[PDB]
Amino acid sequence: NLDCWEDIDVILKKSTILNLDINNDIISDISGFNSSVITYPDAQLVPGINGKAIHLVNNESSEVIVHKAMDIEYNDMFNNFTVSFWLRVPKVSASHLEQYGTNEYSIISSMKSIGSGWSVSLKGNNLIWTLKDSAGEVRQITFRDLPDKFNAYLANKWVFITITNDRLSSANLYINGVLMGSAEITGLGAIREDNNITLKLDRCNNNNQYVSIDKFRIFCKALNPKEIEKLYTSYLSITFLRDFWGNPLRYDTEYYLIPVASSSKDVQLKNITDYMYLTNAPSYTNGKLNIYYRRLYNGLKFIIKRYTPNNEIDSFVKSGDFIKLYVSYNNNEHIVGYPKDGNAFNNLDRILRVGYNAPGIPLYKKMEAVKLRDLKTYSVQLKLYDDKNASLGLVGTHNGQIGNDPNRDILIASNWYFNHLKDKILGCDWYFVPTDEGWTND
Numbered sequence: 001n002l003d004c005w006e007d008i009d010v011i012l013k014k015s016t017i018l019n020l021d022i023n024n025d026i027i028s029d030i031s032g033f034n035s036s037v038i039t040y041p042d043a044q045l046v047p048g049i050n051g052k053a054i055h056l057v058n059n060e061s062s063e064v065i066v067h068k069a070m071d072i073e074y075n076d077m078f079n080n081f082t083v084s085f086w087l088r089v090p091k092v093s094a095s096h097l098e099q100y101g102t103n104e105y106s107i108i109s110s111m112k113s114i115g116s117g118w119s120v121s122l123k124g125n126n127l128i129w130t131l132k133d134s135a136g137e138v139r140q141i142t143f144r145d146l147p148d149k150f151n152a153y154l155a156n157k158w159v160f161i162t163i164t165n166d167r168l169s170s171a172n173l174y175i176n177g178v179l180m181g182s183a184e185i186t187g188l189g190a191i192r193e194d195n196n197i198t199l200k201l202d203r204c205n206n207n208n209q210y211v212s213i214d215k216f217r218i219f220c221k222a223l224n225p226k227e228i229e230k231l232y233t234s235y236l237s238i239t240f241l242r243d244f245w246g247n248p249l250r251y252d253t254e255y256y257l258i259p260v261a262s263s264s265k266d267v268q269l270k271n272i273t274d275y276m277y278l279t280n281a282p283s284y285t286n287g288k289l290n291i292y293y294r295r296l297y298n299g300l301k302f303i304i305k306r307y308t309p310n311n312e313i314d315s316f317v318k319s320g321d322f323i324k325l326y327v328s329y330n331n332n333e334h335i336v337g338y339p340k341d342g343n344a345f346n347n348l349d350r351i352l353r354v355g356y357n358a359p360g361i362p363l364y365k366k367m368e369a370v371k372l373r374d375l376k377t378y379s380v381q382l383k384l385y386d387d388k389n390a391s392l393g394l395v396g397t398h399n400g401q402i403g404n405d406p407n408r409d410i411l412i413a414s415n416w417y418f419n420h421l422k423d424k425i426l427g428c429d430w431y432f433v434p435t436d437e438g439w440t441n442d
C-alpha cells in the first residue's frame, strides 16, 4: 500500500495535504502545511457551495497558483493521492461545440519540457484526467458527459469531482460520489510535476469560456467510495437553501419553478385570482451533436419575499425562513396563497391561487422555505400556514379538474407529503431556476 498515515472523518482530515479555503475574501491553504497561494488580478470570487468560490475567465491575469510547501512538494511522485473539488462549467452552446469541440484546455494542472505531472482538462463536453511520468508515459480517464443537458454534470450546475490514484492499481474519476470513469495506472514511473499547482484556463481558444472551482483539495491516499461519499455530503450544509444551479437561493429574485418529480414540466397560470398547473416545457434536440434538453425560462416567474425582517436583510434564503411567494405576471406581482374555504380536492389538497382578492375572505399566504429531504438535490419544499399557524401542507400538485377545464396537475398545498418524506421521488420537491449566462437555450 502506498497511502499515508477507524473514523472516516478523522481519516479525511489527517490525509489532507492541501485545502483551499476562502475567508475574508482571501484564498489560502488551511491544511496545516501552509502552502502559499498566489492570487492574480483577474481571478474572481463568486457564490460557492459553502461560501465563495474561485472563478476563472479566459485571460492571462485570471489564475490562482499554489506553491507546494516543502513538506508535500513530492507527495505524488511515487505514492497515492486524491484530488477533489467542486466544479461548475457553463452549458456549451451548439455553436461552441462545433467550433471548439476538439479544443482541449486544462483548468487545473501540476504539469510544467515533457510536462510530467497531472492535469484536469475539458474538451467539448468531456472532463479529462491526465497523469504523465518522467518518461513521458501517459494514462487518462475521459468522461463523456450525459447527452441530456438537464441532467448533465458539465451543464452549469455545481458538481463534486473526486479523482483517486492508486499507483498499485488504477485511477478513478467520481462525480457527486458516483464512479464515472477509471484507468489502470500501473507501469508509470515517477511523477515529477511542477513545484506549482496552477488553476487557470490553459490553451482554451474560446475567449468567452469560464469555469468555477471550489474547495480544491489533495489527499495523500486513494480515497475509497465510502470516504468519498462522506467527503461529498460533508459540503452539503443543509442550512442555506440553493437554486437549480447549486448557488444560494436569494430573496427578491425571479425564479422559474420546476417540480423535481416531473422535470419536463413548467408551471403556468389559469388567470389572476385563479389556479396554477403544469404544462410540457418545449425542448431542444441536436442529433448531429447528440445533445438535447428540456428548454428553460418558460413558465411563471416567482419571487420570494421576507415574511418579516431577517437577520440583517441577508440576501440568501435560509431553511426555516418564513416567506411570501409572489408570481411576477405582466409586470405586476401577485401573492400566492390559499383562501379560507377555497376549492380543494376532497378537502385535503388545497388549490393554490394567484392574486386572489375576494373581499372579506382571509387569504393564507405565510410560507416556510425548508429542506426536509433529498440532500444531494438542489431542490426546496414550501410549507403553507393558515392564520392559526397550523400547517396547510407542502406545495405540490394534484391531478384532476376544476369546472369544465381539461384534466390537469394543479398546484396545491397538502399535508399528505409529510407522511412520505422518505420516498425517492416526491411531488413536493421544487427546483428554483434563475436565468443565468451559464445556460442559454439553442
Ligand SMILES: OC[C@H]1O[C@H](O)[C@H](O)[C@@H](O)[C@H]1O
Pocket: 349, 396, 397, 398, 399, 412, 414, 416, 417, 427
Ligand atoms: O400521488 C399522490 C397525489 O395525491 C395527493 O393527494 C397529493 O395531491 C399529491 O401527493 C399527489 O401527487
